[PDB]
Amino acid sequence: MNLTELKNTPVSELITLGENMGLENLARMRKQDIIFAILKQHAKSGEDIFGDGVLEILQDGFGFLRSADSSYLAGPDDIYVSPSQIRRFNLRTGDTISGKIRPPKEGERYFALLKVNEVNFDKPENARNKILFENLTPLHANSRLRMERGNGSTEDLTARVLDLASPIGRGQRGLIVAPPKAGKTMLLQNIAQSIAYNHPDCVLMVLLID
Amino acid sequence: TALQQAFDTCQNNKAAWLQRKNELAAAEQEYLRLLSGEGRNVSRLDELRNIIEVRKWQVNQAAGRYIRSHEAVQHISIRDRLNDFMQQHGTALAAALAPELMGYSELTAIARNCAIQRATDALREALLSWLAKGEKINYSAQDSDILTTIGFRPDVASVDDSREKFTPAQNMIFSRKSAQLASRQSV
């Protein structure tokens, strides 16, 4: 089983598993605790359980593994990663880690990681021989990232205005001077839609603060 | 062998223009195939535009220095065979144009620069009188075979690719485009 679809699914899965597995209750507590409880009662049978997420290292090497679905809460669903795994696989912060996870015995509370089969969407040993991002020499913008979808939608006109205003390139650095009540939400929604539609090859991540 | 090596260099850069013309032809054929095809991604079209533009600038400058090399190899042979002939039988036409050269030799610089246009007009009228016949003449046997390969006039492509002229800033930016394209092709 994988925790990705368990985190994606709504409370309907919660109630169905509550009435199937016969849990004493699942209603009045945090969703992370519910996921922990259901995964514990699923793994108590001894079946193999999978895990995926993003790994990070704290000040003492106490490796944590968070999930992008939950916006990286420090909840019980985070996967423990011992410093031995880091020192044996050279996994740094932000690495995409997928592997078999270990049920916690008495003494620890977070789930550990047994094995690994995919690091950064690649073979774990292949990721050992990688070039550092800071060591890479930067360059100018070369590949144009057009805002025009070409489908002639209502906000495709706004996209065309953005095209006529400022070209966008791969590896660029954009700053928007947006006072409040600007409608900037509409423009950023159009930008995200155009990035997803015109160029599905590039991987898109969006970050929002407060 | 200066004429021979000049013609060899002319052949070299002409052939170089030929291969980059073949990469051009490849560029517009793949352009047409991808434009008539399923062009969902626009970035690929973007670099298609970039390479076709830098390639057309490259063939423009190729035609430019090919015309320059053709003119140079024409004039080097012209002056070589001309001075050979003029040293071979110069006395007759020297005596035929004796007053002008005599005034050139032993008078001041102003007369030196004033005899040249008189000689120019005399040569012009002589050539105009001769060329009214319109008889065809052949190249010098020492260089006829070489010049027939290149011809008196260059290729029609070489002259219709040279209509457009770019600003020196545009020349700099397109040379930079050529350098970055070479770097891309290296990778």
Swiss-Prot record, chain B:
Keywords: Late protein. It comes from the Viruses. The keyword 4Fe-4S does not apply. InterPro entries: Phage_P4_Psu. Gene3D superfamilies: Phage polarity suppression protein monomer. The keyword DNA-binding does not apply. One of its GO terms (biological process) is symbiont-mediated activation of host transcription. Late protein which functions to suppress polarity of amber mutations in the late genes of the P2 helper phage. This is Polarity suppression protein. It comes from Enterobacteria phage P4.
